[PDB]
Amino acid sequence: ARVTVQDAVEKIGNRFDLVLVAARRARQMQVGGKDPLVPEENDKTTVIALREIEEGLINNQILDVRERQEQQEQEAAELQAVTAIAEGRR
Amino acid sequence: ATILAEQLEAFVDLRDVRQPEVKEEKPEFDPILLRPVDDLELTVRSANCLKAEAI
Amino acid sequence: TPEEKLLRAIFGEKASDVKDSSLRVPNGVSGTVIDVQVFTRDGVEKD
Amino acid sequence: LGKRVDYSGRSVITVGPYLRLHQCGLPKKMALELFKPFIYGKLELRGL
Amino acid sequence: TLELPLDSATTESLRAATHDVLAGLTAREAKVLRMRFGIDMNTDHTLEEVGKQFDVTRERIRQIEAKALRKLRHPSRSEVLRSFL
């Protein structure tokens, strides 16, 4: 099947939870660049192509979870505020 | 049968030191070369001499 | 048009009055031709 | 009730012993058509 | 009247990048056209443009513009003027 996928649903007593754990955060990593990701480059997927590795994926960040934190409206309020992101050419 | 013989000459201990396949394929190009000469910032003089010489 | 001459001035200034607006081959697979018919205003009863 | 998808494909169905339980085969040319906006995003980053 | 997503990214990159490479050109001829309608309003004043740069007369009012036109051929990857028509 896939790598470390059935291990994330057995470690915690829920499946629908793991979804947003690697959803509202994963899609947020791209719209925020890549700097917000402070963990080491160890927890990262591997893509075999041209004798090198690219992309990034996820499902390898879920380790230190918690109950109550932030609401749900600020997730994309101060995120797109600190970093605007765009696309320019020479 | 001769073809099969050559397909085993590596086991008869023969002086044949040749490399198998050392090919490296990774299709790449330089689309930037397809850009006109108006991307190097030139003067009107050269911008009229080159274009006059099929450039 | 004046503003148009600017674009072609970069990729060889050669803008002719008439162009080639022929019927191009639709997407898919091409094929040979069978027959060709030309009716340049025949003296017959054509509508 | 029915919204047409902007990105979809369709063709004849065949078999593939090489495939796995969690794998599926697909046409070659169809790959370029489907992931069109995506393939251009990687070609720019590369050298192609 | 409504551009599709296909050319939506093309038309955007064809009207906001020329004023970047425009600076890299002879100050005199470039500043005449740029600092006239691009920063202000209305172009071609003749007896007013002659006192805007404080130099020549009303002759180069047509020359400078023409000399600049052929210089607009420079912006290849970048474009702005080639869209109005």
Swiss-Prot record, chain A:
Keywords: DNA-directed RNA polymerase, Nucleotidyltransferase, Transcription, Transferase. It is an enzyme of class 2 (transferase). It comes from the Bacteria. The keyword Phosphoprotein does not apply. Its EC number is 2.7.7.6. Pfam families: RNA_pol_Rpb6. Promotes RNA polymerase (RNAP) assembly. Latches the N- and C-terminal regions of the beta' subunit thereby facilitating its interaction with the beta and alpha subunits. The RNAP catalytic core consists of 2 alpha, 1 beta, 1 beta' and 1 omega subunit. When a sigma factor is associated with the core the holoenzyme is formed, which can initiate transcription. The rRNA transcription and antitermination complex (rrnTAC) consists of RNAP, NusA, NusB, NusE (rpsJ), NusG, SubB, ribosomal protein S4, DNA and precursor rRNA; S4 is more flexible than other subunits. Gene3D superfamilies: 3.90.940.10. This is DNA-directed RNA polymerase subunit omega. GO terms for biological process: bacterial-type flagellum assembly; bacterial-type flagellum-dependent cell motility; cell motility; cellular response to cell envelope stress; DNA-templated transcription initiation; intracellular iron ion homeostasis; nitrate assimilation; protein-containing complex assembly.
Curated annotation (Swiss-Prot), chain B:
It comes from the Bacteria. (Microbial infection) ADP-ribosylated on both alpha subunits by the phage T4 protein ModA. ADP-ribosylated on only one of the alpha subunits by the phage T4 protein Alt. The modification ADP-ribosylarginine is found at R45. Homodimer. The RNAP catalytic core consists of 2 alpha, 1 beta, 1 beta' and 1 omega subunit. When a sigma factor is associated with the core the holoenzyme is formed, which can initiate transcription. Both the N- and C-terminus interact with different regions of transcriptional regulator CRP. The rRNA transcription and antitermination complex (rrnTAC) consists of RNAP, NusA, NusB, NusE (rpsJ), NusG, SubB, ribosomal protein S4, DNA and precursor rRNA; S4 is more flexible than other subunits. Belongs to the RNA polymerase alpha chain family. DNA-dependent RNA polymerase (RNAP) catalyzes the transcription of DNA into RNA using the four ribonucleoside triphosphates as substrates. This subunit plays an important role in subunit assembly since its dimerization is the first step in the sequential assembly of subunits to form the holoenzyme. The N-terminal domain is essential for RNAP assembly and basal transcription, whereas the C-terminal domain is involved in interaction with transcriptional regulators (such as CRP) and with upstream promoter elements.
Curated annotation (Swiss-Prot), chain D:
It comes from the Bacteria. Co-administration of salinamide and rifampicin or salinamide and myxopyronin suppresses the emergence of resistance to both antibiotics. Transmembrane segments: none annotated. Coiled coil: none annotated. Acetylated on several lysine residues in the presence of glucose. The RNAP catalytic core consists of 2 alpha, 1 beta, 1 beta' and 1 omega subunit. When a sigma factor is associated with the core the holoenzyme is formed, which can initiate transcription. The rRNA transcription and antitermination complex (rrnTAC) consists of RNAP, NusA, NusB, NusE (rpsJ), NusG, SubB, ribosomal protein S4, DNA and precursor rRNA; S4 is more flexible than other subunits. Belongs to the RNA polymerase beta' chain family. DNA-dependent RNA polymerase (RNAP) catalyzes the transcription of DNA into RNA using the four ribonucleoside triphosphates as substrates. Resistance to the antibiotics salinamide A, salinamide B, rifampicin, streptolydigin, CBR703, myxopyronin, and lipiarmycin can result from mutations in this protein. This is DNA-directed RNA polymerase subunit beta'. It comes from Escherichia coli (strain K12). The gene is rpoC. The chain holds residues 343 to 390 of 1407 of the full protein.
UniProtKB/Swiss-Prot annotation, chain E:
Residues 47-66 bind DNA. Coiled coil: none annotated. The record marks R36 as: Interaction with anti-sigma factors. Residues 21-74 are annotated as: Sigma-70 factor domain-4. It is found in: Cytoplasm. Changing R70 to D/E: 2-fold reduction in activation of class II Crp-dependent promoters. Disulfide bonds: none annotated. Residues 58-73 are annotated as: Interaction with anti-sigma factors. It comes from the Bacteria. Contains 4 domains, connected by flexible linkers. In the active conformation, the domains are in an extended conformation, each making extensive interactions with the RNA polymerase catalytic core. Sigma factors are initiation factors that promote the attachment of RNA polymerase to specific initiation sites and are then released. This sigma factor is the primary sigma factor during exponential growth. Preferentially transcribes genes associated with fast growth, such as ribosomal operons, other protein-synthesis related genes, rRNA- and tRNA-encoding genes and prfB. Belongs to the sigma-70 factor family. RpoD/SigA subfamily. This is RNA polymerase sigma factor RpoD. The lineage of its organism: Bacteria, Pseudomonadati, Pseudomonadota, Gammaproteobacteria, Enterobacterales.
